């Protein structure tokens, strides 16, 4: 009201509070009910006609099937059957998941005396008791599960390395040839306008300045790439992509937007490896003293 904020809508008594429930909404059309009832019943009878349990069953006529069960074949059977199902079930109700897997295995499997060693023999084998419990696979072992360089990048003489560094109050991007020759300069959030004498520092290092910067850098990055390749005799004429390794410094906000501005260039730039290099301070030289300590 006066120099204060208006309340939220629900802070007022109900607008229609004085109008009785029967009125909101009106139920009208009571005339048609009976009509649609008779209609639906007549319909039902038609649906009965389209298609067209008190067959008396005397218990004395069944006796042969009863004597069938008093023979101990069938009771040997019931005993076997019931001793199978007494085994402490963990199921407790029909479960969709477990059914799915089960029958999945039925599709996968539809697609698919020597003297017992005594306890003494295993008493003399020290090794065996360490084979039984071991984690280590016994058989020829996969080599790709050993080698150091197995999961790691694999580069090519032609690859471009795009560095996206998100900082606190700023974000910037560059590219480099595999041999470390710099392509275009480093486009920065304060280099492109986008920064000073403006809305504020709080939004300076924001998501969309990172986006602005990357989408502005790629745009300029293409032609000079076609040039540097035109110089060495690699035409890269058409239906070509630039193989890209995106390296990201970060944990700041400008990171997110940055990479997004790359993702939309997927018709031009092909990203092979996304690997970030973000420095971690184990211990080192003093950082600048902040306010409190």
């Amino acid at each position: 009201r006066r120099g204060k904020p208006r309340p939220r809508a629900g802070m007022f008594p109900d607008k229609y509070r004085r109008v009785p429930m029967l009125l909101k909404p009106q139920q009208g059309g009571q005339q048609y009910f009976n009509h649609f009832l008779i209609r639906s019943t007549n319909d039902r009878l038609t649906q009965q006609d389209v298609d067209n349990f008190i067959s008396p069953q005397l218990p004395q006529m069944d006796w042969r099937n009863m004597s069938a069960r008093s023979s101990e074949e069938s009771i040997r059977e019931e005993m076997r059957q019931l001793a199978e199902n007494d085994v402490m079930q963990h199921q407790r109700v029909f479960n969709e998941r477990m059914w799915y897997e089960k029958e999945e295995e039925h599709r996968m499997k539809a697609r698919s005396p020597p003297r017992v060693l005594g306890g003494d023999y295993f008493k003399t084998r020290f090794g065996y008791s360490l084979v039984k419990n071991s984690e280590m696979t016994q058989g020829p072992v996969d080599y790709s599960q050993l080698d150091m360089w197995g999961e790691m990048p694999r580069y090519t003489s032609d690859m471009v390395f795009l560095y996206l560094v998100s900082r606190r109050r700023n974000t910037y991007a560059v590219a480099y040839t595999y041999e470390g020759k710099r392509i275009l300069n480093t486009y920065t959030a304060g280099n492109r306008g986008l920064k000073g004498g403006d809305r504020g520092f709080r939004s300076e290092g924001s998501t969309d300045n990172g986006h602005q910067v990357t989408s502005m850098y790629l745009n300029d990055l293409l032609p000079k790439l076609r040039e540097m390749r035109a110089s060495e005799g690699r035409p890269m004429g058409r239906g070509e992509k630039v193989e890209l390794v995106v390296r990201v410094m970060g944990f700041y906000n400008g990171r997110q937007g940055a990479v997004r501005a790359v993702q939309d260039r997927a018709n031009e730039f092909h990203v092979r490896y996304f690997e970030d290099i973000t420095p971690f301070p184990l211990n080192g030289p003093k950082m600048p003293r902040g306010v409190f300590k």
Binding site: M159, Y163, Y176, Y178, R182, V271, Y273, F274, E275, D276
Partner: peptide
């Protein structure tokens, strides 16, 4: 050395093949 095999060579905390 800022590209290919780089200053960050063994200093890379994470690697994701896309």
């Amino acid at each position: 050395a800022h590209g290919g095999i780089s200053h960050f060579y063994g200093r890379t905390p994470m690697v994701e093949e896309v």
